[PDB]
Design a protein around this nucleic acid. Structure first.
Ligand SMILES: [Mg+2]
Ligand SMILES: [Mg+2]
Ligand SMILES: [Mg+2]
Ligand SMILES: [Mg+2]
Ligand SMILES: [Mg+2]
Ligand SMILES: [Mg+2]
Ligand SMILES: [Mg+2]
Ligand SMILES: [Mg+2]
Ligand SMILES: [Mg+2]
Ligand SMILES: [Mg+2]
Ligand SMILES: [Mg+2]
Ligand SMILES: [Mg+2]
Ligand SMILES: [Mg+2]
Ligand SMILES: [Mg+2]
Ligand SMILES: [Mg+2]
Ligand SMILES: [Mg+2]
Ligand SMILES: [Mg+2]
Lengths: 136, 171, 63, 180
RNA sequence: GUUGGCUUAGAAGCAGCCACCCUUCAAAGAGUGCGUAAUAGCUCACUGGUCGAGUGACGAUGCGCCGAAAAUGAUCGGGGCU
RNA sequence: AGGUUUGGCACCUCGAUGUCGGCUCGUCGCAUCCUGGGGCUGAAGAAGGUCCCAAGGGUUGGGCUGUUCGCCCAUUAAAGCGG
């Protein structure tokens, strides 16, 4: 979620997913197909959603995380400066990036627990399995 | 689908164009069938081939045979359905060929049967629909069924023979 | 069954969470005394097919 | 398993299912075009855990082990597939998955067996006999137990690639909470 | 075994948190849905029979379907187009 | 989604496009207040709830306030929402 001290501001641009893998930290994982921002909530609700459908088990891994601060109209117009320091925090994700990963649950077990968290997400997604093994 | 058609010795079918007719002991019944489809008598028992394996085809294959099959059992044994009245003091009579029904309705409801169909009420609460055409007989007994549809609570109304009905039991 | 087990084994309730907090176990003696009324009951071949039969349950009960 | 044509021409590839690749022993390397269909039907059976034979058009059979594979993001299918060679009994260290056989009595205790790391690099000797898997018995460990890399069985003198004390399998405790 | 143990006014496959072994067997989950205040009551999982040739499950893609309510009279420019 | 709110923006209009509310006169949309046809119900009947189809017609008089609104009185099948 919202983090400790920073640079405090940003603009915006979009490429393709750089540091997201295919797999990591578990059997099954979740992958975003569309460039977008994810907020402090969303993924926070996604954790809660997924975990609710589990035993509550601590087997869930979230590779994503909010860094980028966003802003908003104090009330209205253009009068004055750029403003809105805390409105919300976002985490940019690009396609192919892996978002969440789970541990030790079965096939349908994590299929449905990803599906529940599929909603609450501004983008379409697909879960996965491991073939490419890369650790270095 | 099922290809074979069992054909009794008293029925005649002439397949030409879009006109396929059967004549037998119960009278003539003529039901139009598809031209693009191939239907003709092979030996004694009837055979309806289909032109292709295409999706829109084979859809009228499973249709056509039973339609002819219905025409076969239509001009042979005919068709009948049994209707049952349930609920307090429900009853049916007969005036001419017409069914006189009285059920829980201020002004009694009656039905004039279309030709080829005939009503039978051998018992006061037992109604039988008799006829050749398997289509019309359906909507005939579905009309009789209209008058009172059995309620979700006491199941009062017109039903089919021994058909079983679930009950809500509100109070 | 365990009404004939808990009492004779000296247990008040049983295993609430048998995998985590353990209750206890017992001697092999409990197989015989429950096997007298279970001859016509338990479906088995004749003679000794009922030996390992009567109690497998204490092992699955958590006691 | 097999390939015929292997040109420098790029657009002859995706007209059929084929992956742009290479192979090298350091004595030489060369153009590659490999059928994708039977490849991921093959690699699936093998990975880095073992080598398979290659037959190029022109009657040349050189046995090789899969090394690194560059995957396309936004899709499943791979775009690259690097290959390496075999010189017995020296050849390069091989990544070995941790398969965790038997049910621990600590998973029965309300915990979960979790493998911190898989595909251990190790090495040696024969790349005929390569350790296509790694068997690790977990029945001994229960809760809080961290099995390290010095406890892992590797026959025929295969030296550990990483630190001996590095944690591979650790069973994680049951979910706990106290304060409101 | 059987209403597996815990808990509840009781909860016996099915409020529910823990677990999910054994016996018989051509074979039947301490069990999927319906049901009761609780077991009963009805099908599935699986076995055997009867009948014929395929049939069932995940994803990829082309083109479509629903999702698709705003104010004077409508329409792709129109006629009209499979 | 809509384009009725407060806004953003500054595009036509400062050699002038008269601003709130009422009264008069209408007409239109349907995201339907009533009435008409339906499905579900924790629908026995009666009386309702929710969703669906439906814009033909209809939708009261008063007290306080410039008010629109809103609150109250007495009613009603109903005392619709906007343009
Ligand atoms: Mg840009
Ligand atoms: Mg990197
Ligand atoms: Mg129950
Ligand atoms: Mg409750
Ligand atoms: Mg369970
Ligand atoms: Mg039963
Ligand atoms: Mg049966
Ligand atoms: Mg405006
Ligand atoms: Mg400007
Ligand atoms: Mg002027
Ligand atoms: Mg003027
Ligand atoms: Mg409407
Ligand atoms: Mg109504
Ligand atoms: Mg329903
Ligand atoms: Mg009513
Ligand atoms: Mg509504
Ligand atoms: Mg108006």
């Amino acid at each position: 979620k919202r983090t400790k001290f920073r640079k405090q501001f940003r603009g915006r641009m979009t490429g393709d997913a750089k540091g997201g893998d295919y797999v990591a930290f578990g059997d099954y994982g979740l992958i975003a197909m569309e460039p977008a921002w994810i907020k402090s909530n969303q993924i926070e609700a996604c954790r809660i959603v997924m975990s609710r459908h589990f035993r509550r088990g601590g087997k869930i891994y979230i590779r994503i995380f909010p860094d980028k601060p966003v802003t908003k109209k104090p009330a209205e117009t253009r009068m004055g400066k750029g403003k809105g320091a805390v409105e919300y925090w976002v985490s940019v994700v690009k396609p192919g990036r892996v978002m969440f990963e789970v541990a030790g649950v079965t096939e349908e077990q994590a299929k449905e627990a990803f599906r529940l968290a599929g909603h609450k997400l501004p983008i379409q997604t697909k879960m996965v399995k491991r073939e490419v093994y890369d650790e270095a | 689908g099922k290809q074979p058609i069992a054909v009794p010795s008293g029925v005649t079918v002439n397949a030409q164009d879009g006109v396929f007719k059967v004549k037998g002991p119960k009278g003539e019944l003529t039901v139009p069938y598809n031209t693009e489809l191939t239907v003709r008598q092979d030996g004694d028992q009837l055979l309806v081939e289909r032109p292709s394996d295409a999706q829109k085809h084979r859809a009228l294959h499973g249709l056509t045979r039973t339609l002819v099959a219905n025409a076969v059992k239509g001009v042979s044994d005919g068709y009948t359905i049994n209707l049952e009245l349930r609920g307090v003091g429900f009853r049916a009579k007969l005036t001419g060929k017409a069914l006189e029904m009285n059920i829980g309705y201020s002004h009694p409801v009656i039905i004039e049967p279309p030709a080829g169909v005939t009503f039978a009420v051998p018992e006061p609460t037992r109604i039988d629909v008799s006829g050749i055409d398997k289509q019309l007989v359906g909507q005939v007994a579905a009309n009789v069924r209209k008058v009172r549809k059995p309620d979700a609570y006491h199941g009062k109304g017109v039903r089919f023979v021994g058909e079983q009905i679930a009950l809500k039991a509100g109070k | 069954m365990s009404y004939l087990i808990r009492k004779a084994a000296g247990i008040g309730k049983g295993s609430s969470t048998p995998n985590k907090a353990k209750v206890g176990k017992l001697n092999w003696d409990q197989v015989l005394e429950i096997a007298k009324t279970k001859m016509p009951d338990l479906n088995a071949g004749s003679v000794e097919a009922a030996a390992n039969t009567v109690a497998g349950t204490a092992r699955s009960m958590g006691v | 398993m097999e390939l015929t044509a292997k040109p420098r021409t790029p657009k002859q590839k995706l007209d059929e299912s084929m992956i742009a690749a290479v192979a090298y022993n350091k004595e030489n390397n060369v153009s590659f075009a490999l059928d994708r269909k039977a490849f991921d039907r093959a690699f699936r059976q093998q990975s880095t855990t073992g080598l398979f034979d290659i037959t190029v058009e022109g009657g040349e059979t050189f046995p090789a082990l899969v090394k690194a594979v560059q995957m396309d993001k936004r899709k499943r299918a791979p775009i690259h597939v690097d290959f390496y060679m075999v010189t017995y009994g020296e050849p390069v260290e091989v990544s070995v998955p941790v398969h965790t056989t038997g049910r621990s009595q600590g998973e029965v205790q309300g915990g979960l067996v979790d493998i911190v790391v898989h595909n251990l690099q190790i090495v040696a000797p024969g790349p005929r006999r390569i350790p296509q898997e790694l068997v690790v018995d977990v029945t001994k460990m229960n809760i809080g137990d961290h099995i390290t890399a010095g406890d892992i069985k590797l026959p025929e003198g295969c030296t550990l690639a990483a630190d001996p004390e590095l944690t591979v399998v650790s069973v994680l405790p049951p979910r706990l909470t106290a304060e409101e």
